Amino acid sequence: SSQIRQNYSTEVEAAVNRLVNLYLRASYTYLSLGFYFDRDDVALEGVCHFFRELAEEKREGAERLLKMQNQRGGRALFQDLQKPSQDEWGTTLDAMKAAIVLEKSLNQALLDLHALGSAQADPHLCDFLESHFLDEEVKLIKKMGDHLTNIQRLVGSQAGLGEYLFERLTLKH
Amino acid sequence: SSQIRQNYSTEVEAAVNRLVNLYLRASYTYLSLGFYFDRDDVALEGVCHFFRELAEEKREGAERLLKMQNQRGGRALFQDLQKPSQDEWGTTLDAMKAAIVLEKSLNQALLDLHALGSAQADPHLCDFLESHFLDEEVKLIKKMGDHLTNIQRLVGSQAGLGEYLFERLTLKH
Amino acid sequence: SSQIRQNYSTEVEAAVNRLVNLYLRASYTYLSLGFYFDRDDVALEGVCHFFRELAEEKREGAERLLKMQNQRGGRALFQDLQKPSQDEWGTTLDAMKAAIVLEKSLNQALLDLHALGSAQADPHLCDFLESHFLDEEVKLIKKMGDHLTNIQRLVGSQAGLGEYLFERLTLKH
Amino acid sequence: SSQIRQNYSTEVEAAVNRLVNLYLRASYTYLSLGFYFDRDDVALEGVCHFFRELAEEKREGAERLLKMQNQRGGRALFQDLQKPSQDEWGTTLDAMKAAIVLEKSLNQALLDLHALGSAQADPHLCDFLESHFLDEEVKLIKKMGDHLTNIQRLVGSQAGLGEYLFERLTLKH
Numbered sequence: 001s002s003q004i005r006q007n008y009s010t011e012v013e014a015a016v017n018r019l020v021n022l023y024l025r026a027s028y029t030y031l032s033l034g035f036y037f038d039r040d041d042v043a044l045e046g047v048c049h050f051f052r053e054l055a056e057e058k059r060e061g062a063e064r065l066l067k068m069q070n071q072r073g074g075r076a077l078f079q080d081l082q083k084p085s086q087d088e089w090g091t092t093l094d095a096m097k098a099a100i101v102l103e104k105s106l107n108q109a110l111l112d113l114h115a116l117g118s119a120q121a122d123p124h125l126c127d128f129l130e131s132h133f134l135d136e137e138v139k140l141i142k143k144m145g146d147h148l149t150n151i152q153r154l155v156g157s158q159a160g161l162g163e164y165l166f167e168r169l170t171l172k173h
Numbered sequence: 174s175s176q177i178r179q180n181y182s183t184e185v186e187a188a189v190n191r192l193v194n195l196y197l198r199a200s201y202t203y204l205s206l207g208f209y210f211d212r213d214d215v216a217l218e219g220v221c222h223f224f225r226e227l228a229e230e231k232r233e234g235a236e237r238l239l240k241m242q243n244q245r246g247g248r249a250l251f252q253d254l255q256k257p258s259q260d261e262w263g264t265t266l267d268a269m270k271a272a273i274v275l276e277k278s279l280n281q282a283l284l285d286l287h288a289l290g291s292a293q294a295d296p297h298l299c300d301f302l303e304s305h306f307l308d309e310e311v312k313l314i315k316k317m318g319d320h321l322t323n324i325q326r327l328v329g330s331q332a333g334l335g336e337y338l339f340e341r342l343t344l345k346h
Numbered sequence: 347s348s349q350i351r352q353n354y355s356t357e358v359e360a361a362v363n364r365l366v367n368l369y370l371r372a373s374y375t376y377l378s379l380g381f382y383f384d385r386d387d388v389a390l391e392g393v394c395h396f397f398r399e400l401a402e403e404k405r406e407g408a409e410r411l412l413k414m415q416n417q418r419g420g421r422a423l424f425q426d427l428q429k430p431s432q433d434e435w436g437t438t439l440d441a442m443k444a445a446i447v448l449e450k451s452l453n454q455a456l457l458d459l460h461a462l463g464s465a466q467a468d469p470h471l472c473d474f475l476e477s478h479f480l481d482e483e484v485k486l487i488k489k490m491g492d493h494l495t496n497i498q499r500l501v502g503s504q505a506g507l508g509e510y511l512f513e514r515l516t517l518k519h
Numbered sequence: 520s521s522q523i524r525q526n527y528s529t530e531v532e533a534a535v536n537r538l539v540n541l542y543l544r545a546s547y548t549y550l551s552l553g554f555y556f557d558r559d560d561v562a563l564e565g566v567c568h569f570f571r572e573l574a575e576e577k578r579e580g581a582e583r584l585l586k587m588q589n590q591r592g593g594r595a596l597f598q599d600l601q602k603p604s605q606d607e608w609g610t611t612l613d614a615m616k617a618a619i620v621l622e623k624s625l626n627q628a629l630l631d632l633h634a635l636g637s638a639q640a641d642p643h644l645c646d647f648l649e650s651h652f653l654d655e656e657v658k659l660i661k662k663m664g665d666h667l668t669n670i671q672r673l674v675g676s677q678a679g680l681g682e683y684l685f686e687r688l689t690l691k692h
């Protein structure tokens with residue numbers, strides 16, 4: 001059973017399992033994005049790398065949530081990971097827009113869980129998401145917004161040229 | 174416009190701009206305090222340094238707030254910085270009392286903003302001020318209270334002697 | 347009072363206090379410029395950094411002037427810092443033009459003070475501004491003129507592309 | 520004779536020789552001050568050291584002036600060094616007041632020489648005193664003013680105690 005569970009509602013436990021699924025789905029979406037930019041007919045290494053980095057970050061988030069679930073005496077329950085929404089992701093601009101939409105959705109889910117935990121009187125969950133999730137999301141979304149603005153400025157006139165330059169001069173390590 | 178703003182009210186955005194102005198005004202007040210203690214007819218180096226340190230700390234606080242404003246998709250709006258309340262600051266005791274009053278006012282403004290963000294359901298702002306502002310203020314106010322007590326104990330009898338000794342033995346690096 | 351003041355007119359003392367206010371206002375303007383280029387819908391890091399660097403340089407200038415004021419036995423008097431002339435600063439070209447106008451105004455104020463000190467027979471002030479101010483201004487204005495020329499050359503045709511390239515290849519550290 | 524003299528008036532040459540004599544006399548005064556504070560019935564090591572430091576600084580100033588005299592093709596002419604104005608120098612307060620009076624007199628002599636060189640159209644002399652003399656004097660006079668203020672604050676009530684504390688906590692290395 002559990003010998004440790006204290007002040008941890010079934011509602012929060014369920015919400016945490018949903019958040020795990022959302023973070024893993026986000027990770028899977030970023031894996032698809034990464035390999036799309038690795039196609040020989042796409043071939044934007046900086047972009048591929050940006051998304052592969054995010055795949056790992058999202059997986060790490062899911063893992064931290066699962067660790068927290070066990071620390072509180074809750075029980076992890078996994079669901080299917082739905083395949084990403086697209087098989088082909090278009091331009092770097094299209095991809096960055098999809099990424100922002102995805103991150104905003106995770107952020108909203110975190111805000112929904114915080115509003116649950118506060119309604120459940122759960123201070124620990126509240127300082128857990130605080131912390132390794134809400135702040136990280138804000139910073140990442142700002143970075144993505146900065147990127148979108150730069151990508152948009154570079155769309156001429158000459159979209160191909162701009163796409164190459166962004167990958168070379170902003171993204172590539 | 175902004176492509177990133179999420180769960181960030183116009184009320185909080187305005188409050189953050191006000192807090193920026195308050196921190197910069199505090200920085201300006203500490204600049205005035207610092208140079209006052211640098212006067213040849215005042216000449217208390219430890220005291221000058223204590224206040225110049227605080228001028229930089231307050232400026233840094235304003236800058237962190239401005240960074241947060243942009244991270245959330247809010248827009249910085251600057252107002253005039255009102256000149257400090259005094260041109261001459263009296264004794265080290267007078268100056269330390271004015272500093273405590275000033276810090277208490279910043280702290281109260283932070284508490285007012287936290288009470289706004291909670292009423293706005295904004296967990297990120299709440300863990301932003303938590304964090305790099307509320308705890309810092311508490312520690313600084315305690316230090317100032319400790320200093321005031323020591324300064325007061327040293328006021329004889331022989332105020333000049335006590336003022337010199339505090340600067341030499343507590344404040345001076 | 348002062349026990350040290352020698353060959354230091356009330357007119358020069360007042361002029362120095364005005365110059366302090368001008369340098370601090372310039373610092374505040376550069377702070378506004380810096381955070382504008384940090385907006386998610388502007389997002390030009392090299393430009394943000396260029397202006398934040400200048401904010402610190404101008405503050406440092408004000409501080410050197412205040413130190414000199416006390417060394418001569420004059421008394422610092424602070425005035426309000428007027429908010430910057432704009433809330434939004436347009437393009438990198440607009441911003442660099444505003445910066446040049448601002449620096450030229452500081453330079454003119456330094457030239458006005460030198461012409462005062464010479465009319466006051468004050469050699470020390472004359473070799474103080476010589477020195478840490480006039481030469482610095484000339485070098486900075488030349489750098490800004492160089493930047494403006496490069497920015498202008500890059501305005502096509504394709505203004506977005508040129509703005510990105512200047513930030514990436516000239517400004518960004 | 521000289522094969523190098525250019526734009527160097529007999530009036531400036533004479534003024535430089537007078538300044539040499541003034542700096543050497545100041546050095547001699549500081550030597551007397553230093554050894555007075557070394558008396559077994561005075562015994563203030565920090566004070567003795569402060570003045571012995573100044574004796575060396577003033578001698579170094581005289582030497583720089585003599586070097587400049589030869590660089591310009593002028594001819595050094597030495598006069599008697601008048602013995603210092605006092606044989607006993609009283610308290611640290613009395614001594615610091617005498618030192619400030621002495622430095623102000625050197626500064627005034629430098630200002631008189633600058634006003635000569637400008638009336639002689641001598642830019643080199645003007646940037647020579649600028650430079651290794653006028654700025655040094657301003658800084659030293661400020662330091663002395665700071666010291667006087669601290670000494671005065673310490674005169675109770677209990678003059679002996681204050682004199683000891685200043686020597687221990689401000690002056691002594």
Ligand SMILES: Cc1ccc(C(C)C)cc1
Pocket residue numbers: 053173
């Ligand atoms: C942040 C980060 C992640 C992965 C790498 C690889 C390319 C070594 C570099 C930086």
Ligand SMILES: Cc1ccc(C(C)C)cc1
Pocket residue numbers: 226346
């Ligand atoms: C905390 C602090 C800040 C500034 C200094 C300067 C004097 C080096 C030292 C310590």
Ligand SMILES: Cc1ccc(C(C)C)cc1
Pocket residue numbers: 399519
């Ligand atoms: C000149 C200068 C000023 C600041 C920095 C930061 C980015 C380290 C670098 C260079």
Ligand SMILES: Cc1ccc(C(C)C)cc1
Pocket residue numbers: 572692
């Ligand atoms: C500035 C100075 C001059 C002399 C000494 C001696 C005591 C070593 C130390 C410092």
Ligand SMILES: [Ru+3]
Pocket residue numbers: 038045048049
């Ligand atoms: Ru790859």
Ligand SMILES: [Ru+3]
Pocket residue numbers: 049053173
């Ligand atoms: Ru990487």
Ligand SMILES: [Ru+3]
Pocket residue numbers: 114126127296299
């Ligand atoms: Ru919370």
Ligand SMILES: [Ru+3]
Pocket residue numbers: 211218221222
């Ligand atoms: Ru100081």
Ligand SMILES: [Ru+3]
Pocket residue numbers: 222226346
């Ligand atoms: Ru310090």
Ligand SMILES: [Ru+3]
Pocket residue numbers: 287299300
């Ligand atoms: Ru809170």
Ligand SMILES: [Ru+3]
Pocket residue numbers: 384391394395
């Ligand atoms: Ru930045």
Ligand SMILES: [Ru+3]
Pocket residue numbers: 395399519
């Ligand atoms: Ru830099």
Ligand SMILES: [Ru+3]
Pocket residue numbers: 460472473
């Ligand atoms: Ru000049």
Ligand SMILES: [Ru+3]
Pocket residue numbers: 557564567568
């Ligand atoms: Ru000795």
Ligand SMILES: [Ru+3]
Pocket residue numbers: 568572692
């Ligand atoms: Ru020494």
Ligand SMILES: [Ru+3]
Pocket residue numbers: 469472633645646
């Ligand atoms: Ru001159």
